[PDB]
């Protein structure tokens, strides 16, 4: 039995870099092509490169030279795809698959798959909030911070209109020096940066919106003492618009169970515009969820729940969470749903 | 507001080569406190800025070292000795002396390379899916953007497995696959044929041209069959109701929820009922799509009322007519009881 047996699933931040490996077994390895390709959730095929493990010639795609490395240990059989510098949509399904003997142009034999997550959550500084929003109006950011002494940092947000430069926007001192804050001239009056230090946050209320606000956002944390550092967020598109109906997060209520079979659920409300993608458990929970498609409500936005049976035995011990994500206006929300205990 | 001005607009260099850039500023950038806060820079195409100097000449850790900062007063200097293929993008100086805080113009550094290539090959296949009977003989298409004479193969996807190769170098059927498979064609048109449709055949299918590096995949074409059996017996819905939470009551709205879940067929009836008064006009529905599994429906009813007219009422109902109940079921809760 010819096979490829790949190594597990792997989460992992962005900059960093993946490691998988691939056993061959039933077979002579080093007489045959290996390759490496990926699908993206939702998306197609992609060919990394290629290494021939009787020589370790490589052959790599341009988009991966000097960032792919295909390595073989041939005492164990095993073929190797590091990737360093990972982004965003490096996300995918890793294979690696053998071609059919004396060429290596097709794919015989492959593997089950590796899942390689980025994860969004593992960063130093990354934004929620944005969209569309109409002149004269408000809108408000948020940054979560993770990974450094927030409270010593000097925090700032900047901004870039499209084909721009960087202008600086606002900054927020440290407790010592009294939380105090500071403004680009354009935006006093109109903008306000607060923290909560308790909570690793940061925020932008951004009142009076014109058009030349329009510009993607990027939360910024800076440091000098004797370790320095000056830390960006990943951006987020605030567009100043009055042709577009106005972007708003959702907000999620808990549909707690009752007090055989139990019911629950998230009740999805008032966002715009369409979608949202709601999951139970990160993932975990899958069978018996029905999401229902949203509905306009007179307000002018979506509301739609997700329920999930399960048996009550489980209303002890499982813990129940689902999972919102509002690309259009870069929010997500958890709520846990627990039973009401009087 | 201190200025910052950057020369050259941009610049390229082969790939190796050094680039230098220089910033100038409209006052000095020196501190009370007698540093410069002058610092560097680099936006990669599509991302954040990144940080690399700060104070002039510091690196921010793992800023390697071909990275190099120079310059004093209102003249400043970025040095990349060896610009390598990361390396490219804008680059911008900025500045942390005096408020308002501002950065410069940018200079984008890019890679020349005489030698243009040919382009990659692109693989478009048709239709984008397709529905079809069992037996059926279906035929889909591939088009190549160059000719790729012979050098194609044809590959089988079922959701969460991996693909599965059906036919190598445009007609050659591989070992093990059925022989309803077969694929014809050459150069730049391709045409993969399954003689007789059968119940296992319902998946991706995707082209793959083996010319040239890189080697490159089509966008896929879906192949379902809808079923064609009877009906499913009938399944009643089980039913819950939920009351508003008190999250949700803080914000002057209650919705009640009223699920019926897993039943056939589709037709139901919800009725909500307020201390017993039948209700009309401010609910809504809405329906799942018919099961893949099991092909029942799921159903949600929801009740909007403000929170003073939620408080002013004891008991809610949703009443649930569906033909496998023997009679209408009542499912309810009593405000503020447990």
């Known amino acids: 039995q010819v096979q490829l047996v790949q190594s597990g699933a792997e989460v992992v931040k962005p900059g960093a870099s993946v490691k998988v490996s691939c056993k061959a077994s039933?077979?002579?390895?080093?007489?045959?092509?290996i390759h490496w390709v990926r699908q993206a959730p939702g998306q197609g095929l992609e060919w990394i490169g290629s290494?021939?493990?009787?020589?370790?010639?490589?052959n790599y795609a341009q988009k991966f030279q000097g960032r792919a490395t295909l390595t073989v240990d041939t005492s164990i059989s095993t073929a190797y795809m590091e990737l360093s510098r990972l982004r965003s949509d490096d996300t995918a399904v890793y294979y690696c698959?053998?071609?059919?003997?004396?060429?290596?142009?097709?794919?015989?034999?492959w593997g089950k798959g590796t899942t390689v997550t980025v994860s969004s959550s593992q960063v130093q500084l990354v934004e929620s909030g944005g969209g569309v929003v109409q002149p004269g109006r408000s809108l408000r950011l948020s940054c979560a911070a993770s990974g450094f002494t927030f409270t010593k940092a000097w925090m700032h947000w900047v901004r870039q209109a499209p084909g721009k430069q960087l202008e600086w926007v606002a900054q927020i001192k440290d407790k010592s020096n009294s939380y105090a804050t500071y403004y680009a001239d354009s935006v006093k009056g109109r903008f306000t940066i607060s923290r909560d230090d308790s909570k690793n946050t940061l925020y932008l209320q951004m009142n009076s919106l014109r058009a030349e606000d329009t510009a993607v956002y990027y939360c910024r944390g800076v440091y000098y003492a004797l370790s320095p550092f000056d830390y960006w967020g990943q951006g987020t598109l605030v567009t100043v618009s009055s042709r577009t109906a106005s972007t708003k997060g959702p907000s999620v209520f808990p549909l707690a169970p009752s007090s055989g079979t139990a019911a629950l659920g998230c009740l999805v409300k008032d966002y715009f515009p369409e979608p949202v993608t709601v999951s139970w458990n990160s993932g975990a929970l899958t069978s018996g969820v029905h999401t229902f498609p949203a509905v306009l409500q007179s307000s002018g936005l979506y509301s739609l729940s997700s329920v999930v049976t399960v048996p009550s035995s489980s209303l002890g011990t499982q813990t129940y969470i689902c999972n919102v994500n509002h690309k259009p206006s870069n929010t997500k929300v958890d709520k846990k749903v627990e039973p009401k205990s009087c | 507001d201190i200025v910052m001005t950057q020369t050259p607009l941009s610049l390229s260099v082969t790939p190796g080569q050094p680039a230098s850039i220089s910033c100038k500023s409209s006052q000095s950038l020196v501190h009370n406190n007698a540093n410069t806060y002058l610092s560097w820079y680099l936006q990669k195409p599509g991302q954040s800025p990144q940080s690399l100097i700060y104070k002039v000449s510091n690196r921010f850790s793992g800023v390697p070292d071909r990275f190099s900062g120079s310059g004093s007063g209102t003249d400043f200097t970025l040095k990349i000795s060896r610009v390598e293929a990361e390396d490219v993008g804008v680059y911008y100086c900025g500045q942390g002396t005096q408020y308002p805080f501002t950065f410069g113009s940018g200079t984008k550094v890019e890679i020349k390379g005489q030698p243009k290539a040919a382009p990659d090959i692109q693989m478009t296949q048709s239709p984008s899916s397709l529905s079809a009977s069992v037996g059926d003989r279906v035929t889909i298409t591939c088009q190549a953007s160059?000719?790729?004479?012979?050098?194609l193969n044809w590959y089988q996807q079922k959701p969460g497995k991996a693909p599965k190769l059906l036919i190598y170098?445009?007609?050659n059927l591989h070992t093990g696959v059925p022989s309803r498979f077969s694929g014809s064609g050459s150069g730049t048109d391709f045409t993969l044929t399954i003689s007789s449709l059968q119940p296992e055949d319902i998946a991706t299918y995707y082209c793959?041209?083996?010319?040239?590096?890189?080697?490159?995949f089509g966008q896929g074409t879906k192949l379902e069959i809808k079923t064609k059996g009877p009906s499913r017996t009938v399944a009643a819905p089980s039913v819950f109701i939920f009351p508003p939470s008190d999250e949700q009551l803080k914000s002057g709205t209650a919705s009640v929820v009223c699920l019926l879940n897993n039943f056939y067929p589709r037709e139901a009836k919800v009725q909500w009922k307020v201390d017993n008064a039948l209700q009309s006009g401010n609910s809504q529905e809405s329906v799942t799509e018919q099961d893949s599994k099991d092909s029942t429906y799921s159903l949600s009813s929801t009740l909007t009322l403000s929170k003073a007219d939620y408080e002013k009422h004891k008991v809610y109902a949703c009443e649930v007519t569906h033909q496998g109940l023997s009679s209408p079921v009542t499912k309810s809760f009593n405000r503020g009881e447990c």
């Open positions: 290494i021939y493990p009787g020589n370790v010639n490589t």
């Open positions: 698959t053998r071609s059919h003997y004396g060429l290596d142009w097709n794919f015989d034999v």
């Open positions: 170098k445009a007609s």
């Open positions: 793959q041209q083996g010319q040239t590096y890189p080697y490159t």
């Open positions: 160059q000719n790729i004479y012979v050098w």
């Open positions: 039933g077979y002579t390895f080093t007489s045959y092509y």
